[PDB]
Amino acid sequence: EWNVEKFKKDFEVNISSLDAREANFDLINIDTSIANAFRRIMISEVPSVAAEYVYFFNNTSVIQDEVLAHRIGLVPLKVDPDMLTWVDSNLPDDEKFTDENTIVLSLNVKCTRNPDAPSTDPKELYNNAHVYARDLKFEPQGRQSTTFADCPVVPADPDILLAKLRPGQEISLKAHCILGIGGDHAKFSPVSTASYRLLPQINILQPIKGESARRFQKCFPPGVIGIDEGSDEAYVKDARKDTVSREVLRYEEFADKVKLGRVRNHFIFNVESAGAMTPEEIFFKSVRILKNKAEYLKNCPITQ
Amino acid sequence: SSRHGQKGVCSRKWPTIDMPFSETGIQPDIIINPHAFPSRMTIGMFVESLAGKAGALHGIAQDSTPWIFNEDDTPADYFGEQLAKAGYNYHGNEPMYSGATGEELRADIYVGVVYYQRLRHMVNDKFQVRSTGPVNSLTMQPVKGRKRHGGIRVGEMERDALIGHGTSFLLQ
Amino acid sequence: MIVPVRCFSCGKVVGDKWESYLNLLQEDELDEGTALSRLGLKRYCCRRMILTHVDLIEKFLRYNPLEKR
């Protein structure tokens, strides 16, 4: 038996840590199909902003045009989504890129020889030798000048080495950065790894006090099993600490006295980010997509 | 291909959404079938798998020159001991979860780091379709050629397969 | 060629840690194990992207056909 008011009693969240980049939390007493649905939407459905069309005016470097375009699209941009809307690819290119859809970035680099005396390091030897991702300059086309004036568009990781040059060579491009989801292409995925692990369970069956208690410590990570003496003998302190190495089953001394299993409802999510959004906010955005993924079907005519 | 003669075609590009993930959160780049290995007998791939994984963890690179290991000094017990020092499974296995259903898999999956290759000949220029097109002027039969929209040959042996089925209208 | 922007398997941005990693090994005189762990790389899918990179662009940039000699 199941109820939507019995789910509210038993479901608990324990947030272990939180950061501007990663977030470790728990989901007690939820289903493996619900927890997998939250995992997928964070990877494949929560939208992000990435460079989709790259317009080269000149590229006299070594890195090919279709390679250097691909490296720009993989740069994580610190645009907050829902400041953009979605593009519409059924209407032509002169109608398609309004400033509500598109963020325009550009790059203009020319490498020259530097007069310097000494093998020597190539940043003390040329000018604009290494092209970093912070050289993507934000061009506020239109009304973006006043609404992106509190938060300018800049990569979340500015020291991404995009290219390298030598004197004579140049890169002169301009990219159009558009909103999309990560099931289209892996560049629009907001997250480094949004993934859960299931809670380990260490079931002791017989007491292992004594010399057994000392090496059964070393079959687990160094904070999992606790020992005092024969008094307060052997138990789990933190099963969440345990990596499931199955290192105790390879010893015939302990291959009977423990059953390694899992708690099948306690999930341990590790959500990270590329840097556009915070990982507690790509989880609210993920739990609301699955909600709206079913409002759209409830409010829909059952055709045929 | 790997460096052991385990080549094979890319049969499908498979999304991360429904590709199995680990305790660590690692979707593998390459899934290889375990039914490749019993008849090919590339157990150098089973020890390259658990020695690349140990080397990517500890940051070291390992020697794979032949006749360095003995029968008393098996590499499954050498590189496997380097996985147990990190905090992994000794046997190269690793707990995986299903990317489709979401439940954990039945046993632990043998995952590691193997060096792969990409063969130069590709299927970009192999095939042809033809509905109708140019002919040969002596025979009024479709021309030969992959570029010029040429026909498929139904030769002497393919003719006899159509007499064998008894179908006189597929031969016609 | 140049260091890839993102890791192939997880998706961490890794392209900003190649010039950091070479200065960790040259000046701090660390080993490759600690220098990867200082840079926040701790999944072995994501370790090998910096660990096992060749960086052949330095050999390609020696052939500049725009500059004399």
């Binding site: 272990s16 840590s17 990663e22 470790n24 993934s195 859960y196 692990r197 990570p221 160094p222 904070g223 969440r240 600490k241 345990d242 990596t243 341990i268 999510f269 590790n270 | 305790e23 660590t24 959160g25 963890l57 500890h58 070291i60 020697d63 360095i68 290991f69 003995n70 000094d73 590499p75 050498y78 380097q82 020092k85 990190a86 905090g87 992994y88 | 194990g33 762990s37 701790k42």
Partner: peptide
């Protein structure tokens, strides 16, 4: 015949999701 040498200083570098060097 010489063994294949045990590489020395090889300590733990696999921690669970959200753990760090909290093991001394």
């Amino acid at each position: 015949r010489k063994d294949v040498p045990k590489v020395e200083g090889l300590k733990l570098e696999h921690f669970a999701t959200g753990y760090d060097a909290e093991d001394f």
